[PDB]
Amino acid sequence: AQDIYRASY
């Protein structure tokens, strides 16, 4: 399973 989104580049 994926990690969640937290931060853009």
Next chain:
Amino acid sequence: GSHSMRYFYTAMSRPGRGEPRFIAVGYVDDTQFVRFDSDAASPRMAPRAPWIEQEGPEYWDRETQISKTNTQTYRESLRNLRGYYNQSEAGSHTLQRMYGCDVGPDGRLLRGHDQSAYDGKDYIALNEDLSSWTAADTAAQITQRKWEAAREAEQWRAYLEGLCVEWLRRYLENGKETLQRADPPKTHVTHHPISDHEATLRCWALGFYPAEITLTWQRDGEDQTQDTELVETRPAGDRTFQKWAAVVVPSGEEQRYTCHVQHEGLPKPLTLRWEP
């Protein structure tokens, strides 16, 4: 054996042809098990291996939500990176991310990974300590500072040491009949005359899984690294892989040459010769 889980994200801008495409695929070793494509008619994280199909609706809902969020956020990230490099809005660019974890035979963490590339060039990577980053250039330093401020490394460490390995262990058990089965290469040597003076000996390995293999030629017991043509390991389309290694040998000297094969599926390493 040892095993890995990896997610591969690709975001590709295409000015004048809509918003950037986002694709996400997940692998356990050399086995793809999920895919997402924002260009699909109905974007959804979808199964690509039978052993993931038993995950319930809550699993698919979560994985799809993550991918749909990343479709949006990787478009922001591409806008940011364009600015970081003072680039025109006219050009197409690519942002790639790889991340995941490796475990050994006992299921324990060997190490974690999270790294990225922009237009095919290394951009930023999480160090093996899962605490700090290596930034490639002053643009990636902006990303680094932003991620440091947000305590990203701590979050990545928690995922990589926790959920990443827990899911990978689950997948390895649910898919054990294939994921934890190494299929040895089927091997043979062919002979192809070039001229009156020389012929090619080609050492074949077919039908093996996983892809990792070592295929070499020796002459009188010396490795022929510089004089071996070695093709890239290639997928057959049935989960397995193929490779060959070739050497040009003088007519009549064929029995001086031996092909050696190492692969996880083999009881022991093979030595082969041309058998006319």
Next chain:
Amino acid sequence: MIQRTPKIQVYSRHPAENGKSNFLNCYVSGFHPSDIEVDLLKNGERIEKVEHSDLSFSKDWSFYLLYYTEFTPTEKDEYACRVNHVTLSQPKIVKWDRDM
């Protein structure tokens, strides 16, 4: 930015034997950026029912794809893979050779 030109291999899934239905593969790899055009050919003409794998990439960030279709090798029929990419000024054609 630097672009990378594709490597191309053409081959069958199973050992080739004339008259026996099999799968023809064209593996393109090592390229960047990811846009690429691939055709499988039978006696110079494009095969219509060609599928391909999902785009992914290798550790060195280069992309790869597998194009494939059913085929029945014979002594006379010629098969090939035709590839175009931004790095190529013209399409590159690689012939299927059952010895490689």
